[PDB]
Amino acid sequence: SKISASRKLQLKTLLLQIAKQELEREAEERRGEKGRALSTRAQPLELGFAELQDLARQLHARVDKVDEERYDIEAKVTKNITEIADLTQKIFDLSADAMMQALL
Amino acid sequence: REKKKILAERRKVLAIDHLNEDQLREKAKELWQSIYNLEAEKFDLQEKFKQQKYEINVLRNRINDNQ
Amino acid sequence: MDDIYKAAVEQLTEEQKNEFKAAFDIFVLGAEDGSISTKELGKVMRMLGQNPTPEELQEMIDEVDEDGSGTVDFDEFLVMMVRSMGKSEEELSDLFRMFDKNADGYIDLEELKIMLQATGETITEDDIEELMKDGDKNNDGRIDYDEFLEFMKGVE
Ligand SMILES: [Ca+2]
Ligand SMILES: [Ca+2]
Ligand SMILES: [Ca+2]
């Protein structure tokens, strides 16, 4: 070989560190993106009696809206879990320290 | 004049229309927190959906290349 | 998985090598070729509190035998010693995605070079030539998911 096995092992180790680093940052971007989406999709409350009970009914109906949308995307994720499980099954089808003491 | 639609609107009248000033502003807080919680779950499910599409794509490459 | 062990051998201090040579020279007392046959290896394991079959034993010799001689010499003995001194597949799958920057399901040479450049270490054309050389075992210009798993087997 044209470089030492110790070098290729050093490079492989450093490659994994920075890939892990890119994974971590990607998770931090996702956190910040989630907060921005929630500030848009769930603007915090800003508070008369009649206007209050109109709002509460609008919020009550919105709860029903969101939970139906959230179910609809959960159904797609669920079939993807079963599909992944089907594709994964298709791919499947395709000691020394006691010696040194006893010798020395 | 749909019976299932009429009943679907009676659920918020039954839930809200009988509270006084202050249970109303305390019920509205909990409704919003529920909406916020559901949207947070919905965002996470959307992120998971994208990652599955990539994972399925990789799986399809592997099956084709190992056949 | 074999060049991880030769990296460990390369990083043995002269004190482990001097100790391992003393143990090896005792190991080979009586052998006519001056190497560890199944006879001597069996004696040490019979005496280490085990009991191997005469072919259970040939398997351990043949696992480090880069000689086709059914015997273990000192260099093969060092490999054997460090082999007795990785990362989960679900974790490697997520790291694999960080390489595949165009998300096509493969890592090509340029994506490998972008990651290498990101390491901070100085990279040479032989570093890159032999890293892709180790990963791509069907020399098709890509390292797929399965090749990536074997490429990284045992990497800390
Ligand atoms: Ca040999
Ligand atoms: Ca790619
Ligand atoms: Ca390949």
Tokens 């020279």 locate to C25
**Distance (Å) of CA C19 to CA A104, B60, C25:** 9, 51, 10
Which helix (H) or strand (E) covers residue C18, if one does? helix C14-27
The answer to whether residue C156 is domain-embedded is no
Tokens 């010799």 locate to C61
Q: Tell me the H-state helices in C28-139.
A: 38-47, 56-64, 74-82, 89-99, 109-118, 125-135
The answer to whether residue C69 is domain-embedded is yes
What count of other Cβ atoms lies within 10 Å of the Cβ of residue C75? Answer: 14
- Please give the structure tokens belonging to residue C2: 């074999």
C133, C76 Cβ separation under 8 angstroms: no
Are A42 and B35 a contacting pair at CB < 8 A?
Answer: yes
Domains: count for chain C: 2
Side-chain half-sphere exposure of C35, counting CA atoms within 13 A: 17
**CA–CA separation, C138 vs C122, rounded Å?**
27
Q: Which residue is closest to B55 within chain C, CA to CA?
A: C105
Domain that holds residue C10: 2-82
**CA–CA separation, C84 vs C97, rounded Å?**
32
Binding site, annotated residues of C for Ca(2+): 65, 67, 69, 71, 76, 100, 102, 104, 106, 111, 136, 138, 140, 142, 147
Task: Please report the sign of the dihedral spanned by the C-alpha atoms of residue A58, residue A60, residue A61, residue A62.
Answer: positive
C31, C39 Cβ separation under 8 angstroms: yes
- Could you tell me if C103 and C137 lie in one domain? yes
**CA–CA separation, B19 vs A59, rounded Å?**
15
User: How close, in Å, is residue A3 to chain B by CA atoms?
Assistant: 30
Distance of CA A78 to the CA centre of its chain: 15
Q: Which residues pair with C72 in a beta bridge?
A: C36
CATH number, domain of C142, equals 1.10.238.10
**Distance (Å) of CA A23 to CA A16, A31, C147:** 10, 13, 21
Which of C83-90's residues contact partners 24+ apart within 8 Å by CB, and which partners?
C83/C5, C84/A95, C84/A96, C84/A97, C85/A96, C85/A97, C85/C8, C86/C152, C86/C153, C86/C154, C86/C155, C86/C156, C87/A16, C87/C152, C87/C155, C87/C156, C89/C149
Task: Please report the sign of the dihedral spanned by the C-alpha atoms of residue C95, residue C101, residue C106, residue C109.
Answer: negative
Which of A57, A63, A84 comes nearest B35 by C-beta?
A63
- Could you tell me if C94 and C65 lie in one domain? no
**Distance (Å) of CA A79 to CA A69, A75, C8, C97:** 16, 6, 45, 22
Task: Please report the sign of the dihedral spanned by the C-alpha atoms of residue B32, residue B37, residue B43, residue B46.
Answer: negative
Q: In this structure, what are the phi and psi dihedrals at residue B11, rounded to the nearest 5 degrees?
A: -65, -35
Closest CA to B15 of A58, A60, A62, A67: A60
- Could you tell me if C73 and C138 lie in one domain? no
What amino acid is encoded at B38 in this protein?
L
Find the length of chain B: 67
- Could you tell me if C31 and C50 lie in one domain? yes
Domains: count for chain B: 1
Closest CA to C1 of A99, A95, A8, A18: A8
Domain that holds residue B31: 3-65
A49-84 burial: b if 16+ Cβ within 10 Å, else e: eeebbebbbebbebbeebbeebeebeeeeeebeeee
- Could you tell me if C7 and C62 lie in one domain? yes
Q: Dihedral of the CA atoms A16, A22, A26, A29 (nearest 10)?
A: 150
Residues of B in contact with A64 (CB under 8 A): 8
Query: What does this entry list as its resolution, in Å?
Result: 2.6
- Could you tell me if C16 and C69 lie in one domain? yes
**CA–CA separation, C65 vs C2, rounded Å?**
12
- Residues 6+ away with beta carbon under 8 Å from A99: C23, C44, C48
